[PDB]
Write a protein that binds this ligand. Structure first.
Ligand SMILES: [Cl-]
Ligand SMILES: [Cl-]
Length: 164
């Protein structure tokens, strides 16, 4: 298991523009296009992202290319973030993947906001961090996904994703 396989399980793959859990236009493997309510605005962002007149539909390879870019960006946002970097550096390989997943899902800003949980993860207080992570809009709005990430931080294994 690795970050790519992990996120692909969590986000799925869709080749036509769709609306995410928050109702925002997205495509591919969880690639957010825009927060705007306009489909045209989404189609325009899509074309700009792909480099061609897509008409709201992309191919598998194009989906994968956005994905590779998105993971890369997530990793880079963590390393440039003063609050995130130290946490990430302190963690083992499996848990690092969980942190990338959260950033990919909620942005660097969103995660950096989990001040207390981050401090607990840095301290390696797994059970405590897991309890703190659950006290969030993130867990209440997308519980199954959040549970998978929380278990990963708790155990340091890929258990929550094997079978999926
Ligand atoms: Cl882009
Ligand atoms: Cl969920």
């Amino acid at each position: 298991m690795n970050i790519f396989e992990m996120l692909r399980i969590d986000e799925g793959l869709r080749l036509k523009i769709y609306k995410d859990t928050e109702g925002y236009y997205t495509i591919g493997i969880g690639h957010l296009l825009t927060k705007s309510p306009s489909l045209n605005a989404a189609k325009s962002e899509l074309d700009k992202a792909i480099g061609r007149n897509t008409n709201g539909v992309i191919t598998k390879d194009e989906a994968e290319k956005l994905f590779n870019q998105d993971v890369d960006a997530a990793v880079r946002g963590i390393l440039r973030n003063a609050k995130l970097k130290p946490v990430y550096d302190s963690l083992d390989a499996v848990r690092r993947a969980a942190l990338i997943n959260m950033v990919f899902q909620m942005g660097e800003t969103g995660v950096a906001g989990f001040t207390n949980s981050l401090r607990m993860l840095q301290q390696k207080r797994w059970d405590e961090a897991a309890v703190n992570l659950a006290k969030s809009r993130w867990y209440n709005q997308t519980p199954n996904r959040a549970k998978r990430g929380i278990t990963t931080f708790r155990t340091g294994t890929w258990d929550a994703y094997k079978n999926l």
